[PDB]
């Protein structure tokens, strides 16, 4: 039968590791760096675009950052098509929760459900895992601003500042070096862009290679237009 061709995803190695999860994580280590920083007054999301050309519409490409609802955004590293599948599921879940309770979904509930979807593919069904890591930025009235990450295993963790993708050891080193709990969103914007600039493997960080977003106080949720990215890059002295 077909047993010959089954690669047997969802098996343990002798070390008790899930090899498809480890290899999907390797895949994500080649994706464009994304950074989340939780300020006192908000959250910054920043991401590097790996695909670049003069002929790309950077003004309409929106491949790294997505709104999940009015209060929650994600940054993506990895396979954008898999991410779009999961993002659509999360959007539906948030609206189902609002329909049921007439309240906006708590950020952790959304993150947990999407992480559980990712876990399922590691345990049953014989399919490959989703090759995406997310950073979730959100606000809710229970914990306020919250920053989460999740990976192909369906593990999720809360962070004050976090990086996913290529340069994350360097990024987390620089974030440990410069992060402070008191820092404002305008401080965190600088820290994010300085970390991307110091971690990018390109020659220089430029507004076409960037996506940027903020969640700040109601809560407003801004994806930066490229001119705003120019403004912020000159304001930070990076361009």
């Amino acid at each position: 039968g077909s047993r010959r061709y089954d690669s047997r995803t969802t098996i343990f190695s002798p070390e008790g590791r899930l090899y498809q999860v480890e290899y999907a994580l390797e895949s994500i280590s080649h994706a464009g760096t994304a950074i989340g920083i939780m300020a006192s007054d908000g959250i910054v999301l920043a991401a590097e675009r790996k695909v670049t050309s003069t002929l790309l519409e950077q003004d309409t490409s929106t491949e790294k950052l997505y709104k999940l609802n009015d209060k929650i955004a994600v940054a993506v590293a990895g396979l954008t098509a898999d991410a779009e599948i999961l993002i659509n599921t999360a959007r539906i879940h948030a609206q189902n929760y609002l329909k049921t309770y007439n309240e906006d979904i708590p950020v952790e509930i959304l993150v947990r459900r999407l992480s559980d979807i990712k876990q399922g593919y590691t345990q049953h069904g014989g399919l490959r895992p989703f090759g995406v890591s997310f950073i979730y930025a959100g606000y809710d009235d229970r914990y306020g601003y919250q920053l989460y990450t999740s990976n192909p295993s369906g593990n999720y963790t809360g962070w004050k500042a976090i990086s996913v993708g290529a340069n994350t050891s360097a990024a987390q080193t620089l974030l440990q070096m410069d992060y402070k709990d008191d820092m404002k969103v305008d401080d965190a914007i600088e820290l994010a862009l300085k970390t991307l600039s110091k971690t990018t493997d390109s020659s220089a960080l430029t507004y076409d290679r960037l996506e940027f977003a903020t969640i700040r106080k109601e809560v407003y949720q801004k994806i930066f237009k490229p001119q705003e990215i120019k403004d912020i890059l000159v304001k930070t002295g990076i361009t």
Binding site: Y143, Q146, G158, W159, K160, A161, Q172, Q176, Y179
Partner: peptide, 8 residues
């Protein structure tokens, strides 16, 4: 850099 509140 973990947030202790939401790493219960």
């Amino acid at each position: 850099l973990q947030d202790t509140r939401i790493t219960p």
